[PDB]
Structure 1
Amino acid sequence: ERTRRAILDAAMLVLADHPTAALGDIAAAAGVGRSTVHRYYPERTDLLRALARHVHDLSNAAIERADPTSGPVDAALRRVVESQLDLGPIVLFVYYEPSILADPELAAYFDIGDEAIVEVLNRASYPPGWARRVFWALMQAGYEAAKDGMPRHQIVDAIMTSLTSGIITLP
């Protein structure tokens, strides 16, 4: 379990910045040899799908830790947003690398975990499930802004304002 964790953390750290990195680069960052990675993940796709699952699990833990239904909605959503942003740009990688969510099993797993965020967005309230889509869309813009080196506070403010007001105001 420790070695598996070292490998997946190294994959997160490395692929977030260098999405085409060799398995050698990932092994080195984990403090292990290539054969080690191979023993757990025979093919790159194996590693990438394990990585995705691990990232989703960390995302779900951060949601539970943020405790979205506890206390005032504004402060609660900010806790959620801050801790999702702390995952970093690996999230963009996992959602956009074509071979990852192409697996139907993993795609189904990915649909599970954000029910409490949806509750809170519902409480503070559009086609079916649109609000949920918009929230994660704003999160996506947030990850890209973080990628540009924008400070977490300003991203969180931009997301919260976008949730309540959108980005333009029509005459």
Structure 2
Amino acid sequence: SGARERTRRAILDAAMLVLADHPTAALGDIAAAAGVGRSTVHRYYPERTDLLRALARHVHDLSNAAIERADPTSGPVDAALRRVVESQLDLGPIVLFVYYEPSILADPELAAYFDIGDEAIVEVLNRASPEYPPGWARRVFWALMQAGYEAAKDGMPRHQIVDAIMTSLTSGIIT
């Protein structure tokens, strides 16, 4: 049953990666991304609709644990922001679906379905904020997290990416 929960979570994490790159989550794609048999996916999720509902709950659970562990409201804002960046990078493709600023590739209706908000993060950004328009910092933050996710997907070390996002946030890239 420890193995069983591991299998479930592996299928859900696999489905999230597939959905990032494909409108629909075909059974072949999901089973291959999970590294389990097609019949095993069907065992856990008879219908694709059962899988989607379970995926949304899993995404919510991951995001909830991440934000609680980041503890964005306590302590020096520089350290708090770094914990936030680290926490979101570890969520992987979830950052592509954030409601306020979805990735260009995210199916808008999938983003609406997942309904992933960002108030605690908005508040940490505010704590650290010259005269940018309403919502701009929030948009840049999520665009940069998505860039960081893609960089990691493209083979770059997580530590370098976190540092890169932090410097870009505080200093930009050119002088």
CA distance, structure 1, for counterparts of residue 12 and residue 73 of structure 2 = 31
1:168 Cα deviation (Å)? 2.4
Residue of structure 2 equivalent to 1:62: 66
Q: Residue 146 and residue 132 in structure 1: after superposition, are their counterparts in 2 closer, same or farther (change >3 A)?
A: same
Report the TM-score, using the length of structure 1 for normalisation.
0.69
Q: Secondary structure at the match of 2:99?
A: helix
CA distance, structure 2, for counterparts of residue 124 and residue 89 of structure 1 = 26
Report the more deviating stretch, 40-49 or 115-124. Answer: 40-49
1:60 Cα deviation (Å)? 3.2
1:138 Cα deviation (Å)? 0.8
CA distance, structure 2, for counterparts of residue 32 and residue 76 of structure 1 = 38
1:11 Cα deviation (Å)? 2.9
CA distance, structure 2, for counterparts of residue 27 and residue 21 of structure 1 = 10
- 2:157 is the alignment partner of 1:151: yes
- 8 Å Cα contact 2:151/2:161 also seen in 1: yes
Q: Which has the higher contact order (CA 8 A, sep 6+)?
A: 1
Q: Secondary structure at the match of 2:98?
A: helix
- Fraction of identical pairs, as percent: 100
- 8 Å Cα contact 2:10/2:34 also seen in 1: yes
1:37-80 deviation digits (Å, cap 9, x = unpaired): 34665665764565355335412321221111111111111111
Q: Residue 44 and residue 145 in structure 1: after superposition, are their counterparts in 2 closer, same or farther (change >3 A)?
A: same
Report the TM-score, using the length of structure 2 for normalisation.
0.68
1:34 Cα deviation (Å)? 3.2
1:17 Cα deviation (Å)? 9.1
Residue of structure 2 equivalent to 1:28: 32
Q: Secondary structure at the match of 2:116?
A: coil
CA distance, structure 2, for counterparts of residue 45 and residue 100 of structure 1 = 24
Report the more deviating stretch, 13-22 or 121-130. Answer: 13-22
Q: Residue 102 and residue 11 in structure 1: after superposition, are their counterparts in 2 closer, same or farther (change >3 A)?
A: closer
Question: How many aligned positions are there?
Answer: 169
Q: Secondary structure at the match of 2:21?
A: coil
Q: Secondary structure at the match of 2:161?
A: helix
CA distance, structure 1, for counterparts of residue 123 and residue 59 of structure 2 = 22
1:109-159 deviation digits (Å, cap 9, x = unpaired): 655442111111111112222211111111011111111221112111111
- 8 Å Cα contact 1:7/1:30 also seen in 2: yes
- 8 Å Cα contact 1:12/1:51 also seen in 2: yes
Q: Residue 97 and residue 161 in structure 1: after superposition, are their counterparts in 2 closer, same or farther (change >3 A)?
A: closer
- 8 Å Cα contact 1:19/1:93 also seen in 2: no
Q: Secondary structure at the match of 1:8?
A: helix
CA distance, structure 2, for counterparts of residue 163 and residue 100 of structure 1 = 21
Report the more deviating stretch, 57-66 or 12-21. Answer: 12-21
